[PDB]
Each structure stands twice: as structure tokens, then as C-alpha cells.
């Protein structure tokens, strides 16, 4: 499973859409095969692991209890309403699972806005009482590094892990516990349309000639000015990002963005 030599990662799925897992599969230089063969030992991951059922849960127990230590990477919010019953794995609530496992980790990374801040299932009226990891588990002393976004840039996960492995510590974190090396700038201050913003040159509609010519998307709802992420710099899939595809930022790396950034097409 794991013992010596590559650092052990236990990857947990709570209330999630698996988009964060999929983002990790997009890893580029290093690619995911290098990450799981050379860099790390991926010791539990429900999406791709061979074992199922009891065999899978024994793999989890072996990983978590290893004297060698593990890193937890957590995808999804924790449903806390009704004593956690809205989300169960192996007939345990996700709240229970995370409460037992996460305090045992050497380091915890909350990956994606759901794990960091509660995410889509936490949007009003939040029927499942979904919480981010640090909120849910504050009483146990868990302080996960928050890598926000819906999903985040996988560059930001790999970079955080590499930093931690090298330095044996978290990188500098902002007041939302996000690494400043990735989340220190607004989307907007990095945006190629900023000169149009400065000039008050806004697209009035998506069909307009102004939108064709690449004018600023603020009037159409762009949340770049209030969103911290590295999207314009790193891009996604080595090729694009929302504003370059003509669509406003929806604020997806910010807490409560589903309710704070809506309606998405207004500012």
C-alpha cells in the first residue's frame, strides 16, 4: 500500500462532484503517472483504486495507521445536518470519517471550494448542513491548507505538495488559509481585458460587437475584481481560461461564492 520511501497520500471524497479529482488527472509536467509512480504513494482514492468494499476500507485503515505518516487530501464539503446522515461511506458518516482520520494526518490539504469553504451544496438553503473542512472540524484542531477553486488549478495542488515535501511546512497562507504563492493576486489585476476596464469599455451583451472585440466583461457580471486565483497566468489545460473564452469569472475560488457572486450576470 505504503510504508517506506514515497510519501503516503490518503485522498478522501465527501460531498463532491469528482471535478476536483478530475482536475488532478489533468496534471501537466509532472503528469499524473509520474505523481503516483515516482513522487507520491496514492494509498486511498475511491475513483481509481482497484480494491472495493471491505478491501478498500482495509487499505484506508492500513494507510492511516502507518507509522510512516500520511498527508490527507480532501475533496468535498462535509454534510453535518441530521448528525451527518446525508453523506455516508461504508455506512459511516463523512463527518465521522473525517473526524477520525484528519487529526491523524501529518498535513491536510482541502482541495476545491467545497472542501475549503463548503461549496455548492452549502449554498442557500444548505439542506445538508455542508461545511468546509476547517469549519466542520475546528474543534479537533484541524487546519487544512485551502486550495480553492471549482475546481482549482491542479498546478496549485502539486505546487503545494511539492513545497510541503521539500520544506516540511506549509507555504505562506492568506487569511482564508490559501497559499499566497497562488492566491495572492486578483484574477482581474492579471486580466488581459484590464485596459478596457480602465477605459470603461464594457461589452453590453454577449452578441455585441464589443464582446467580439474582447471588451471587458464586468457589465456582464465578471467577478474577477473580487476573486483571488491565478487563472490568467497559469491558464487551464495549458491553453485557456474563462475570460479568454469570452465568459465572466463567476468567483469560484471565494468562500460562499454561490450566494455572494450571484446573480452571476450582474455587477
Amino acid at each position: 500500500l505504503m510504508g517506506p520511501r514515497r510519501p503516503s497520500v490518503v485522498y478522501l471524497h465527501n460531498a463532491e462532484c469528482t471535478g476536483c479529482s478530475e482536475s488532478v488527472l489533468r496534471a501537466f509536467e509532472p503528469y499524473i503517472d509520474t505523481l503516483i509512480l515516482d513522487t507520491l504513494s496514492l494509498d486511498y482514492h475511491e475513483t481509481i483504486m482497484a480494491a472495493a468494499g471491505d478491501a478498500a476500507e482495509a487499505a484506508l485503515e492500513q494507510a492511516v495507521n502507518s507509522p510512516h505518516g500520511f498527508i490527507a487530501v480532501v475533496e468535498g464539503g462535509i454534510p453535518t445536518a441530521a448528525n451527518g446522515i446525508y453523506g455516508k461511506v461504508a455506512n459511516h458518516t463523512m463527518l465521522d470519517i473525517c473526524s477520525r482520520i484528519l487529526p491523524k494526518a501529518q498535513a491536510v490539504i482541502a482541495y476545491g471550494t467545497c472542501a475549503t469553504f463548503g461549496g455548492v451544496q452549502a449554498a442557500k438553503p444548505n439542506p445538508t448542513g455542508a461545511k468546509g473542512v476547517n469549519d466542520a472540524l475546528k474543534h479537533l484542531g484541524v487546519k487544512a491548507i485551502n486550495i480553492a477553486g471549482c475546481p482549482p488549478n491542479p498546478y496549485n495542488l502539486v505546487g503545494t505538495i511539492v513545497y510541503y515535501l521539500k520544506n516540511k511546512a506549509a507555504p505562506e497562507l492568506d487569511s482564508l488559509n490559501r497559499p499566497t504563492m497562488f492566491f495572492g493576486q486578483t484574477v482581474h489585476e492579471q486580466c488581459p481585458r484590464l485596459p478596457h476596464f480602465d477605459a470603461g469599455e464594457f461589452a453590453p451583451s454577449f452578441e455585441s460587437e464589443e464582446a467580439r472585440k474582447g471588451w471587458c466583461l464586468y457589465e456582464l457580471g465578471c467577478k474577477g475584481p473580487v476573486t483571488m486565483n491565478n487563472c490568467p497566468k497559469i491558464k487551464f489545460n495549458q491553453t485557456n481560461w474563462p475570460v479568454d473564452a469570452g465568459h465572466p469569472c463567476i468567483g469560484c475560488s471565494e468562500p460562499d461564492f454561490w450566494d455572494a457572486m450571484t446573480p452571476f450576470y450582474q455587477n
Partner: protein, 534 residues
């Protein structure tokens, strides 16, 4: 060693989301099954009262495996509600991104989700790489050498010798397993291609980002069309085209030959996991308001009666809750849907899932690649018929073999090959349309205060529909009815087993501690539980 008693698989891994499968086994064969979905989020509840334009952004987060599909369904739904007819280029771009999604999704499913049910990766260490290379080169026009495969073996040997098996820890094949049939060389070929597919899928997903901003969770759709003016440029089209061509080569030269070599080794799997009824919505429209303008057409088949394909009547869908963790027992058409959670624990008041149970004219319907392929075949679709016939011929089996776990797995490949080719046709059509001077990608529209709308997508797992009731210009009701809901939802108020449940009856289980046969059938449906429950 023929077991009687229960078997529970929880978690079912190598799916999206949180599934518990329960079976009763008698004398080594499954006699009964329950499909229990163990996470609820409540996106339909969350959407109430919001701006209909916001729906696609929320609903895309139904699922990141079948990313984009729900954004597309919601946008089709709101487009329909407001009565906008999007420009031809918006249809082309939306269709091209969807075709790319199919290719990414199905490649990852076969290799990264399904294949470990049939491939013993550790047995690849025992293989003769020169023999394996000869076999690989015999099934594909792509030539593979002994050195190519030894490099994979060496990397695997280093990994295994570390004792840190990572994702292979406690695999059902470790130590050997009587239900694992492949020889070492075929295991090595499949393992090499599993690894190759980890990098190829990066390209397949990138194709979506070229027009669609990013993968996962695209960001280029709006009511009225699309936003990506850059998608009109020769440079972006060329970038897409290059990624598509490489992805299609992998489909044709790697995936399909591997699928056939594994299917041939597991031909007994034609005997398990059959289903009775099929529903499909069609996909890739010329006309956003006419399902019959789609490259694959909609249809309904009951009791495998493919000579009598019935039209799809959207009013004949109702979603049951009697065996689900919702209030009461009343099935609802989605324009009158209700999402009222009420948990009773496993089998409390005969309820065992967060999924509703969709029924069509009261019947449980398989949807997904086998439905799409079989209905298109039976409609005379020439590309589907050519590929399907070639597959059946290669495998030496008749059409009845498709009604099975193997059949369904094959159908997933068939549709991948057909859609990979058709993306090229759409791409050409799109180029041709630009060349005529049509540079429009979004149309204006107005929000009604009161309206109903529906959007239909045939996603990689089948018929997806999003349903809106607009009231005071806001979301009055928004209901998702998702492919995995059809296939993996529970029983209805007539106690009819769902497709996955029914398909499990008869499954042999060699080793109740390592019940890979259950996984083979369940995985053949490609479950997505975040999709099914939302």
C-alpha cells in the same frame, strides 16, 4: 466454495460518487440486489428562487466526470424556456465540445475505471515483452516493440518492489483470482495502455478547453449561444483539430483493439447483466427544437423489441420515491417534481437510496451507450451499423450477445469510435459555415415571467433532462433527471427492479470476499452517483 448469504460492496470504487451495492447470493449466484446511493446534496432545492441564467453554473457541479453535460442541459433548458433559437455556430461549438467530452469520458472509463476488473496488473510482471509486443502489433496498425513494453514492465517492477502498491493495494487480483483470465502478455499490453491513457486523456480534455475555457467545468455557454469568439479563429480550430485527431487515433488504434482482445477472453460475460428496456434522447442536433434532427435519434424500446421502436414522449417520465429517502410515495413528472428529503436508514420503511426511481410508461429503462447504439442500429444508422457489425464479426458472436455486461462494454467502445469520426464531420461543417461568412455565436433573448422549459442531452451515460418552471422570472422549480438515476436508481412503487438491480440477478461469484463479478456488471453501466442524486 459456493457461497450463500449476503455480500455488500461499500464503497463501490472506480465509479463517480458514493454507491453501496447489496446482494443476496444463493449457491454462488446472485438472487437479489439493491442499488443504494449514499450521498445527497440537494441542488434542486438550492436552485429554487434563483435567476434561471445561474442554473447552468450550479448544475454543472452535479458532476465533474460528465463535466459540461449539465451546463449544456441547463442551457438547452433555459434556451427552450425563453424561446431562443441559438445561432448555427453555437450549435456547432456546443456539439464539438460534447463530442470531445464523450471521447475523454469513455477512454478514462474503460482504462481507469473498468479495466482493473479484468486486468491483473501484477501478472504483467511475469510477461514475455517480446511475445506481448507481437500480440499488440497483431491487433492494431500501431506497431509496438519488445523494448516499448519492457520499459513499462521495468517501471512497474520498480513500483511493485517498493511494496507501496498505492492504487493496487488489496486488489481483487493480488495473489491470483479464479475470475481473472488474461495471460501475462495481455495483462502487460492493457497495463501499458492504461498508463498511456493517463497522458492521452490530458489531450482529450484539453480539446474541450480550446473552445470551452477549461476542463473540468467549462465556461463558454450562455442562454442564446456561446461566448467564445476566439473559437471562430483558424488557430483555435487547428488546435482543436490536432487534439481531436490524436484522441481519435488512440480510440481507433489502442482502445478499440484492447476492448476486443479483452472481450474475446471474457466471452462468458455475454451471459450476464442483461436488461429489458432502453431509452435514449438523441444527440448532436441540427435543430435545437427537433430531437429527430440529431445525429443519434431518440427512441424507446420495451422487452428488447427493436423492431418496434417507440417514439419518446417526454410526458411519460415519472420519478418514484417509494423506495427512496424522500417524503411519501408519489411519483412525479419533473415539471411537477418534488425533492423533499426524508432519511429512514438502510431499508427503513423499504427505502434504501438517495436516488429517485425514474420510470417510462411505468417501466425501468437502461440508458447510455448500449441504449444509444442499439436504438441507432435499429433505426438504420449507417455508421453505428458498420462499427457494430464489425465488432460482432471480430468477436464471433451474434447480436444477442449485446444484451449483457460484455455487450454494454462493447457498446461504449462502438459509440466512442462512431462519435470520434463524427466530430470530424461536425468540424468540417463548422469550418464551412464560417467560410460562408457566418460569424455569429450568440442570439438575443428575453426572460419570460412565466414559462416551462426542458433541455435534453444524450450524455456519455445516457438520457439527461433538465426541467424548469419559471415563475416571476425566477426558478419556480428546477428538476434534473439524470442517466444514472434511470439506470442505478432503486425500485419504484410497483416494486420493479431498476436496470442495474435486475442485471445483477444471475451473477456468479467465485469468491465472495473478492466479488469482482459484481463490479464488472456495475461498472459496465458506468455509474455516476453525484449525477444520479444531485
Amino acid at each position: 466454495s459456493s457461497y450463500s448469504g449476503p455480500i455488500v460492496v461499500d464503497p463501490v470504487t472506480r465509479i463517480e460518487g458514493h454507491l453501496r451495492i447489496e446482494v443476496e447470493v444463493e449457491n454462488g449466484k446472485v438472487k437479489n440486489a439493491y442499488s443504494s446511493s449514499t450521498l445527497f446534496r440537494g441542488l434542486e432545492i438550492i436552485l429554487k428562487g434563483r435567476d434561471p441564467r445561474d442554473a447552468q453554473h450550479f448544475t454543472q457541479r452535479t458532476c465533474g466526470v460528465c463535466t459540461y453535460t449539465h451546463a449544456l442541459a441547463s442551457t438547452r433548458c433555459v434556451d427552450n424556456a425563453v424561446g431562443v433559437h441559438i445561432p448555427k455556430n453555437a450549435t456547432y461549438i456546443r456539439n464539438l465540445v460534447l463530442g470531445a467530452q464523450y471521447l475523454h469520458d469513455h477512454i478514462v472509463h474503460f482504462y481507469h475505471l473498468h479495466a482493473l476488473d479484468f486486468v491483473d496488473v501484477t501478472a504483467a510482471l511475469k510477461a514475455d515483452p517480446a511475445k506481448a509486443a507481437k500480440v499488440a502489433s497483431s491487433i492494431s496498425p500501431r506497431k509496438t516493440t519488445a523494448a516499448d513494453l519492457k520499459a513499462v514492465q521495468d517501471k512497474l517492477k520498480t513500483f511493485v518492489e517498493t511494496g507501496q502498491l498505492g492504487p493496487f493495494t488489496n486488489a481483487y487480483f493480488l495473489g491470483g483470482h479464479p475470475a481473472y483470465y488474461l495471460d501475462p502478455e495481455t495483462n502487460l499490453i492493457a497495463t501499458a495502455h492504461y498508463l498511456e491513457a493517463l497522458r492521452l486523456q490530458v489531450k482529450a480534455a484539453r480539446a474541450m478547453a480550446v473552445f470551452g475555457a477549461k476542463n473540468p467545468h467549462t465556461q463558454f455557454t450562455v442562454v442564446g449561444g456561446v461566448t467564445c469568439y476566439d473559437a471562430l479563429t483558424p488557430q483555435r480550430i487547428a488546435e482543436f483539430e490536432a487534439l481531436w485527431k490524436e484522441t481519435k487515433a488512440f480510440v481507433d488504434e489502442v482502445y478499440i483493439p484492447d476492448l476486443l482482445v479483452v472481450a474475446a477472453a471474457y466471452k462468458d460475460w455475454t451471459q450476464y447483466g442483461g436488461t429489458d428496456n432502453f431509452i435514449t434522447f438523441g444527440e448532436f442536433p441540427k435543430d435545437e427544437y427537433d430531437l429527430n434532427s440529431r445525429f443519434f435519434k431518440p427512441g424507446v424500446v420495451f422487452k428488447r423489441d427493436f423492431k418496434n421502436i417507440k417514439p419518446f414522449d417526454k410526458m411519460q417520465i415519472e420519478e418514484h420515491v417509494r423506495h427512496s429517502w424522500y417524503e411519501g410515495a408519489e411519483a412525479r413528472h419533473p415539471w411537477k417534481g418534488q425533492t423533499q428529503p426524508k432519511y429512514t436508514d438502510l431499508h427503513g420503511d423499504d427505502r434504501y437510496s438517495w436516488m429517485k426511481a425514474p420510470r417510462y410508461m411505468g417501466e425501468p429503462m437502461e440508458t447510455g451507450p448500449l441504449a444509444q447504439v442499439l436504438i441507432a442500429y435499429s433505426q438504420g444508422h449507417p455508421k453505428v451499423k458498420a462499427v457494430t457489425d464489425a465488432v460482432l464479426a471480430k468477436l464471433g458472436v451474434g447480436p444477442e450477445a449485446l444484451f449483457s455486461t460484455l455487450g454494454r462494454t462493447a457498446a461504449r467502445g462502438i459509440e466512442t469510435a462512431v462519435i470520434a469520426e463524427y466530430v470530424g464531420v461536425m468540424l468540417q461543417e463548422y469550418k464551412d459555415n464560417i467560410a460562408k461568412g457566418d460569424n455569429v455565436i450568440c442570439a438575443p433573448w428575453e426572460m419570460p415571467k412565466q414559462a416551462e422549459g426542458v433541455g435534453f442531452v444524450n450524455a456519455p451515460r445516457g438520457g439527461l433532462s433538465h426541467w424548469i418552471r419559471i415563475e416571476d422570472g425566477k426558478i419556480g422549480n428546477f428538476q434534473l433527471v439524470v442517466p444514472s438515476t434511470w439506470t442505478l436508481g432503486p425500485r419504484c412503487d410497483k416494486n420493479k427492479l431498476s436496470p442495474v438491480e435486475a442485471s445483477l440477478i444471475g451473477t456468479p461469484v467465485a469468491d465472495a470476499k473478492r466479488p469482482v463479478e459484481i463490479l464488472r456488471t456495475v461498472h459496465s453501466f458506468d455509474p455516476c452517483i453525484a449525477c444520479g442524486v444531485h
